[PDB]
Amino acid sequence: GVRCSLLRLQETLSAADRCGAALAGHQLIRGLGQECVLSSSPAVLALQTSLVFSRDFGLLVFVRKSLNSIEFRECREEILKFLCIFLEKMGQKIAPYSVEIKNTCTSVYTKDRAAKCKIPALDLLIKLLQTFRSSRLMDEFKIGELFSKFYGELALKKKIPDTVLEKVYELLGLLGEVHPSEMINNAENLFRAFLGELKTQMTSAVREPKLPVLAGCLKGLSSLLCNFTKSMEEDPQTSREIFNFVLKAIRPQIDLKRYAVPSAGLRLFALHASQFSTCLLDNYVSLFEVLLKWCAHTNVELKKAALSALESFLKQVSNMVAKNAEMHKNKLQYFMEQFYGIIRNVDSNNKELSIAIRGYGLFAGPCKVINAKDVDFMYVELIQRCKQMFLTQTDTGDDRVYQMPSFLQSVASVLLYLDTVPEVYTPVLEHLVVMQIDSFPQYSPKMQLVCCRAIVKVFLALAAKGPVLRNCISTVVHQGLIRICSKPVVGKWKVPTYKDYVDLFRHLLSSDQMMD
Amino acid sequence: FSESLRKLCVFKKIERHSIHWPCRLTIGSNLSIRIAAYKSILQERVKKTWTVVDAKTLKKEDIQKETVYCLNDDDETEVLKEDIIQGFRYGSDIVPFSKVDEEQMKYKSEGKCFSVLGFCKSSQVQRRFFMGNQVLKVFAARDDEAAAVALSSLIHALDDLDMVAIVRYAYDKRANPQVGVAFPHIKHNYECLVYVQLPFMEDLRQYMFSSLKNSKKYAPTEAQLNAVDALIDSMSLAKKDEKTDTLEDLFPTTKIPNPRFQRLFQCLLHRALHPREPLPPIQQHIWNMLNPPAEVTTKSQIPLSKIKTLFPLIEAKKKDQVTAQEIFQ
Amino acid sequence: KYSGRDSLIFLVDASKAMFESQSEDELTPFDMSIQCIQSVYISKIISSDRDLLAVVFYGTEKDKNSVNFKNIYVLQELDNPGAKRILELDQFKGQQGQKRFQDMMGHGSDYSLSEVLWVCANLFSDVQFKMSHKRIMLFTNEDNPHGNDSAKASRARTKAGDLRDTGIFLDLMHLKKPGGFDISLFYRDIISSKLEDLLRKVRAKETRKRALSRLKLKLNKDIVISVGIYNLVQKALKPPPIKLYRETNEPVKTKTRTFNTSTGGLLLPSDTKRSQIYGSRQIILEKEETEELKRFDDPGLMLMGFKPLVLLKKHHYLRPSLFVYPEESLVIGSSTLFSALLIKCLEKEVAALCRYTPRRNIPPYFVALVPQEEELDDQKIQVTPPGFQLVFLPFADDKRKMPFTEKIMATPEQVGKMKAIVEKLRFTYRSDSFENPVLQQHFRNLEALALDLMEPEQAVDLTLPKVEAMNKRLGSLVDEFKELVYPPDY
Amino acid sequence: ALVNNMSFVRYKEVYAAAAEVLGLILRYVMERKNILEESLCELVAKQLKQHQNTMEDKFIVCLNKVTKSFPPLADRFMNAVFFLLPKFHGVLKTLCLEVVLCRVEGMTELYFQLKSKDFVQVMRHRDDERQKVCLD
DNA sequence: CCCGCTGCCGATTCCGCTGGAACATT
């Protein structure tokens, strides 16, 4: 297949009748890429990898030799598109050719004029910088001069399409994120650049905002904030502006479709809320309102990042209040009021029940600072409520095993803070842990991570008390093995045999360190 | 204090008589009249340019803008201004031979001129073809004003008729020659000859527009006709009064100043006095200056409502121009 | 359609009868056709340099085309005009070019007149552009390409109608065999000489039609009619130069930037402000601030009322008029109000007065919507369309005050002799034809430079006065004017 | 009124559905032959003509739908189909090829017609749907 | 939760006009 079309694709470049040869070349490229993507056999797959990146013929040679010719722009586009796919199907096994590809992308960006060709080149370069995060190749990617070039592009070029300003800004951020050692001396300027452009796009009183530029600048700022922390501890000038812009980008403005600015803004929030902290207590009411209403937005990708942002927000405010939970007791009262109001509310939104109870458990910590007894009231209210619903309520006549991980995480969070365990709810707590080990298969994937985290957090919680409770770990593990070994092995549900639990323990006893 | 703000009356006999442009009417090649063209009604622009000064030091000399012409090589292999010749798009290609060549072979105007190309009797020169950016008025030359009486005779021969003059006018050697019309005029304090440019054949454009008279989809109902008649009468801006049996000019837009430079002046003043305060609002006398008096609006609401409720559905509105400042607050 | 480029295929006859000059030494009709096509290329290369043009030869001996019919030679597949193609046709001028034509492909053969039409159809059908008009100019003198066959004639008529239904309009200009149109061909069926214009009618022009503004004429509270603001007259000017690299003749890709705050380092558009130094003190404010202090209204027209056409005196001109015409697609029913206003304003001789704002952030400027009545006749003289004319109104300082301290009249007898002279020189102004000498000369010099032929033509300045003509056509009365009351007196 | 909405080109389920139904009706009246067949055939050809030179895509969509059940209508329009064939890319070129497939038999040459429209190259275009039609 | 179309709406490219700033001349 390949190298039959690849040679023909080379010879179409010298053939007369350009823009007629270009159509044949585009078809050759499409068929070749389609053959390459679908082949899954490491021998043939490696042969195709070598042929595609050949030095005499091959895709990159065609791209560099068809670069002073408008007729082939589509072909170039296609090739770059295909490579973004091929780099995804592949992995670090593009590493030998990476620098080659990198150069090609750069060259295209500086010689092709169509944004429909600049965009795929920048996308491929971003995905290269993302694939080889930590590798020997990063020093070979001349990151310093790459930044010099693209940061020149921000000034020494006038009015790019803004579908390429988005990518340029995002790439400038990614340069700070990956291989930051070579960005050390030029990140400050980059920060200014972001703080410049963002400002315009969000504070112009004369011009309609460029949403793609906003998304790109927020993504780049998010990447840059790794390795280059701008905390209120040492930077109470820049960090406050970062927070103001994120707040503007996530708050409910006029009803906007094309959810790309709120999404990136609150992803930045979810990743760096700790970085800008003091501002986070100065807006807790409005922040909580906005984050909640975003969590219910029903958009498949906005809801996910909104939930992550809410988690980080609650975690950060709990940590901040816990340090000084005496003059922030108003905020404690507010958050307990809100969580209780959610719980008392008869909704079918299990998501908001989960976040409510988990924030309740999070704030259990600082509550013991003001009373030292409400922590004892919790883990009794919580244990009793959790026993009444996952331990006797409609053994199979319901579907509310969805919020068992959140309840169990809440219990783990609570009991870490109280001394003198009430010693009579120990059996019921053991029973909850055993049953969630039992109900691991019943969950969907990406919902199995959260319950393993819940189980391990419980295990860590009651392993730090004393040997007397460390015996409960022995009993609960023994019971879980009893349950999963006692299963038959050769509007409908399924039945687990033993397989569904493997990853469970594979996560518990090996893969907590990167998770705990 | 109402009209003094409304008009430029507060400025008077301060601005000098602008400029006399000396030339000569040439009819054929024998008659010649020594003439002084005074530039007249003409678009006005602010005479100061916002200067780019770098922030946090406010110094113009602290920044220099450069302009390099590199190349389209794999790297930006710069070339020098001495290595650059201007070309011209001709079909699908670009023609070299930049500047000295076209300096040699460019059209030469043979100096300034105000020669006459003949005369046009009727409304062959109708105002929708005036094409200039300025309007000149030619009077005369003094110092044995034979020229002045000759041009008075010419003006009276032009205006006692409906006749007008087509003129070949050129400012100087370098100026591109132009062809225009020469109005007779009717003034008693003075008598001029008013000149406006006039299109070349590759200037004017033929566009085809579907007719409205012979339209059945958009035939207007006579109720609509009389509603519009009522609106027009209720919204008139001219009147006959003071027992003179002549028409007056209410709301003379030809008298108020340009609000652009006035509001710029006030903004500069405010930012000079109060460097921290933000943009001021637009003065209310400015808005009152750019609006018809209240009586016409009061006369107009009722016919306006008649047309609103009587003409067909003013239906489709799906557009917006929301600003960043208002979309993020 | 707006982006519909026009197409034109040149189909010339090379059979036997155009390589002999009917016993004359004036011009062989083949050379006449080549002259015509040269003229059309040089015209549309500066008038419509986006239209597609093609040259196809039939009746030749050897063949070239995508179908490989015999005796059909496509010299140029249809594409934008260029200097290369004008030169490629120029190599067939005159008798030397005639023999060159003879030797490259060679005339004399049995063409079909149905394969050639098929080739033209394929040419039209092989381009990937939106075409507004498909037209084929047939350059031939023969009357009966079917002199010995009727099946051939029927096939030709069939394929002609087969072209016509797909919107391909064949038009025929016949190279007069005896030099005058008395050869009356019966083929009014196939087609849908008028050729001197095609040799030279339009030295230079342009083509377009576009809104230039889509606004809302609002009746001051909510009654809004969408409307287009067209530009009837524009003052075209020569194309801008292109910076081109000496050694290779390539565009040079300029890039401008500001830097060096006494250090050397790129300045982003955010770290600079705008200042004006007045007197001694310097006023500073930022770019969006200096963009927003000129902002009064939203784009559109708002009625200030109505004034009769009489009291707006027609020497208050500073900006060429525009043309209001109703646009319904933005808000429906606008054309009804527009027609009502047009009719009523015409009957009352009253023009509307509006506050015009073309772009989003630009000061308002007063305009007068003067109604104009569409004029037309049996000949269909569509020379002004119905609608409004935006006369731009000066404010107070766009006007200027002049000396005015001069008032001397002339006796009511020089007026008579000036009347004599003016009625002597009275002439109809024009319909067209005063083309810009500078622009025309630029086009001619550019033609010469691109085709590097002999040296550039001299555009005949229609703008110059026929000085000797006036002098002779007045005769002995201008001197009578010169010395009637005012001798030099020395 | 039946054929009119085939000019209501905003929803496929309106004009395309009307074209489908029109093809069925016209094949029926042809089969149970009666003197309403030519009148309807010409009437439908009228809107097809009105689409042929102003909206090529809707023209070919409607023509494909009609010729799904009534091939012999295509005979008037195969000239336009061939003239439009080089200008289509994607599913529309496939629709054009199906239309020309409907009447392959009886066409006098169809090989100069195809090779002229560069049939060999379009066959190598990478698409299982179109390749199959080319082989048919 | 997926999966798939399919409206449709946003942005690009291409023009073109206007405005503002810089030029060169008497």
Place this chain on the structure above:
DNA sequence: AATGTTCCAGCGGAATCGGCAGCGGG
């Protein structure tokens, strides 16, 4: 110095077109 020309920069119309949402089926 007054002005006209050239040049650069910015806005909008129009066509295209791709993918972003949301909406049904699986």
